Amino acid sequence: SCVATVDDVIEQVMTYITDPKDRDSASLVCRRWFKIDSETREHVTMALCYTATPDRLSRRFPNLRSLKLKGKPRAAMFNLIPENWGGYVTPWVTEISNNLRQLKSVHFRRMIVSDLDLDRLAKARADDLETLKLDKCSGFTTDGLLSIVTHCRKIKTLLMEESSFSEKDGKWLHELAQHNTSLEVLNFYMTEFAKISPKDLETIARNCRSLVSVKVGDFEILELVGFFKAAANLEEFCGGSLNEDIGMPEKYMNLVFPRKLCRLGLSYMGPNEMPILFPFAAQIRKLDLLYALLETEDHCTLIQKCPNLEVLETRNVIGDRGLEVLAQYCKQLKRLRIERGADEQGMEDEEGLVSQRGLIALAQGCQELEYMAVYVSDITNESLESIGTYLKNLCDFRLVLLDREERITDLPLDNGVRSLLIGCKKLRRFAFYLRQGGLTDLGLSYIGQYSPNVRWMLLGYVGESDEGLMEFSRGCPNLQKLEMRGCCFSERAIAAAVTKLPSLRYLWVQGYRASMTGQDLMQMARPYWNIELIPSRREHPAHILAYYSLAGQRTDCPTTVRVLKEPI
């Protein structure tokens, strides 16, 4: 017996380190520690799939149990990125098929998944695949689905939210009904399915005792009563469809909602059907009024009933008035999102605008907020000051102001932004999209200067000249990903700022002072740094996308995409 070293005990200890950023470190302390991390890492996420070879991954982490790949850039979620752009998943499944023999969970996000490659997935992994997440993907069909539900008989979680595919039939759902037991979560939330029987969804609920969440297409809620009755342990339900004909004023007044149901959002819900929630609103903790059909008043009467609500997502109809209701009724709120509604026929009402008024009201009410994302119609430096004044543990903050309004109160926001970034020092993600005169080179340099923890930034029409970009660039200690559109910055301005940024690994840009040369961008050509240029699909300015990759340049570029490689 010699003295006991750390070496004699590290194999055991490693598996108690969960934090991805601590494994990141542990792997770098020496050769043995690196191997031990390598063989024990369970989950890995690639923010961009083109960032490394699928070979490189399987070599470094032979024993992955869970994997998550992202393809197309965030902009794709706004119909700004060509469909053919990339993110094909096939190289990765043929890698999983051969070298990740341990994988039980797969999550593809904004990628291209084909019928072939998921039949390949299905057959290669079979019963071992507990979870499959097709998050906002395209390129497959119900055949693909039918293939994974017949070969993976033990699927616990299955997800297709916002995916676009070709619907040929419904035998995929029916096959779940007839044979699946293990299902825990089932999600096809933003999806046009027109050939699936609700009877099948009902028989699934009857068979999967562990069924906890389910989100759904445009099913008629009435056809789901059989479901709801059988879905005992159900905690979350988003989706469905509330269709009111006048011939039944009391159509939806006999709804038996599962007892445990505490996270939800019915689609198309009007004021007439809204009442069906009251009998248990004290219990609701998450609300998705995103696709609800109710007006600024109706919002207030409902929010008012949910004191324990800690997450709300809704359109800007919520109104300043609504936000005020939310300010002293739901103190427990942690996440709030306000996507922009119909900005065509006026607003959705005459209170359906949000402004400094509601903002500052909210800042005082819910000081527990950790994520706040708002499409606002008018602001004030003062409002921002109160943000960074009350809700300290804001982690994700996103603000976008609509061009709808003509004159906005006080416009240059330099000093508001400043106290915000200074109070919310827990901030890690930050989005700030304005109108032209919105922020000055001085205010911009504030951002670089007072955002030490921010790793992602989306920036609107900020700055006035290349001065503000360069000033900004000497800051941002931890900035990794940077997206900016609608900017007055020049090609050589960008290029020079990228070199000054210490942490930057991903950059997307739409709108910038170009040049026929194109050679201005070149002055940022590091090694391992790929740059690409784009048009747009679903008058579109050229996009710039650049990212680090230990792979080299992708083979799969569309024709519509150009890769820069020094003097052409």
Binding site: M77, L290, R485
Partner: peptide, 18 residues
């Protein structure tokens, strides 16, 4: 002229509205 791009999920819903 860079128009505020609408998140696809909503854009789809706003038309299923009318």
């Amino acid at each position: 002229e860079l128009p505020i791009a609408r998140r696809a999920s909503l854009h789809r819903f706003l038309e299923k509205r009318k």
